Amino acid sequence: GTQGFAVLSYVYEHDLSVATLHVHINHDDCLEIAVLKGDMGDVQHFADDVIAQRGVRHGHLQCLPK
Amino acid sequence: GTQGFAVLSYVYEHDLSVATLHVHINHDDCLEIAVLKGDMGDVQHFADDVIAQRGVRHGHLQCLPK
Amino acid sequence: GTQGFAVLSYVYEHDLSVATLHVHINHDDCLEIAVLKGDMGDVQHFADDVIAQRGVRHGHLQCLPK
Amino acid sequence: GTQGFAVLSYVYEHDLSVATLHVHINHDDCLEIAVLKGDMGDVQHFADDVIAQRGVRHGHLQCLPK
Ligand SMILES: [Zn+2]
Ligand SMILES: [Zn+2]
Ligand SMILES: [Zn+2]
Numbered sequence: 001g002t003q004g005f006a007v008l009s010y011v012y013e014h015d016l017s018v019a020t021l022h023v024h025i026n027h028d029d030c031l032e033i034a035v036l037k038g039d040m041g042d043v044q045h046f047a048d049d050v051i052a053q054r055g056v057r058h059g060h061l062q063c064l065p066k
Numbered sequence: 067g068t069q070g071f072a073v074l075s076y077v078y079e080h081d082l083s084v085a086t087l088h089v090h091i092n093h094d095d096c097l098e099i100a101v102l103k104g105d106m107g108d109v110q111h112f113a114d115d116v117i118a119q120r121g122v123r124h125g126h127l128q129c130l131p132k
Numbered sequence: 133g134t135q136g137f138a139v140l141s142y143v144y145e146h147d148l149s150v151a152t153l154h155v156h157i158n159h160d161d162c163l164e165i166a167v168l169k170g171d172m173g174d175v176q177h178f179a180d181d182v183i184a185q186r187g188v189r190h191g192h193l194q195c196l197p198k
Numbered sequence: 199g200t201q202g203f204a205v206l207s208y209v210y211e212h213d214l215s216v217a218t219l220h221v222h223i224n225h226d227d228c229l230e231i232a233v234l235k236g237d238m239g240d241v242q243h244f245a246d247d248v249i250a251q252r253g254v255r256h257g258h259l260q261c262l263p264k
């Protein structure tokens with residue numbers, strides 16, 4: 001459907017976010033995992049904004065419609 | 067390569083695990099996110115064992131080789 | 133008050149849980165952090181059950197009333 | 199001892215951080231839990247810097263010496 005949850009993950013260098021986990025890979029890189037919930041369209045747009053940022057690599061969005 | 071990190075995510079109902087996050091979706095379902103690190107082969111085998119379990123659905127493994 | 137959030141943390145070896153994080157300290161010990169929300173009385177009882185378990189050490193409950 | 203792990207938790211509005219979890223309480227407040235590891239002195243200083251920030255409330259540091 002259009003409503004559900006999603007997992008956005010990416011490596012670095014809003015009422016949509018349920019929880020976000022930051023895990024350090026090394027001195028320069030942080031692995032970030034964000035659990036999102038709401039309208040899948042708003043979820044995609046959130047991921048869009050994140051992936052558009054410099055320093056953000058390997059962005060992946062796993063959608064989980066209800 | 068063969069060594070790096072990985073993000074295994076799945077909905078429910080080892081020295082490989084760096085951190086695991088459990089988030090409740092509702093009364094019956096828990097979204098689980100596991101951050102793994104080590105040999106990508108051991109990582110895949112870990113995911114294999116998890117996905118083979120009854121009650122585990124929508125399993126996804128995102129690999130991040132160094 | 134009686135309703136709010138709480139952080140239960142402990143070292144190892146329900147609709148109350150919002151999210152739980154497991155972090156490995158070493159081969160034998162896992163640091164677990166549980167974010168709880170609901171009636172502070174139910175929260176305390178949840179922590180009670182966890183701390184009563186063998187293998188669970190250094191249990192600490194930080195309450196955050198609304 | 200002086201080396202070990204620690205859990206720093208606080209409500210909002212480095213090679214020391216192992217993992218950090220952000221959980222939304224509501225529109226304005228985010229509950230943040232940081233798992234730290236290293237010299238307990240460096241850990242305390244990290245917590246000091248965080249708690250000194252405006253908007254940061256209910257800061258608590260649970261130390262876990264090895
Ligand atoms: Zn981060
Ligand atoms: Zn980082
Ligand atoms: Zn779970």
Ligand SMILES: [Zn+2]
Binds near residue numbers: 089090095097
């Ligand atoms: Zn669950």
Ligand SMILES: [Zn+2]
Binds near residue numbers: 144153155162164
């Ligand atoms: Zn655990």
Ligand SMILES: [Zn+2]
Binds near residue numbers: 080154155156162163
């Ligand atoms: Zn463990």
Ligand SMILES: [Zn+2]
Binds near residue numbers: 220228230
């Ligand atoms: Zn936060």
Ligand SMILES: [Zn+2]
Binds near residue numbers: 014220
């Ligand atoms: Zn926040």
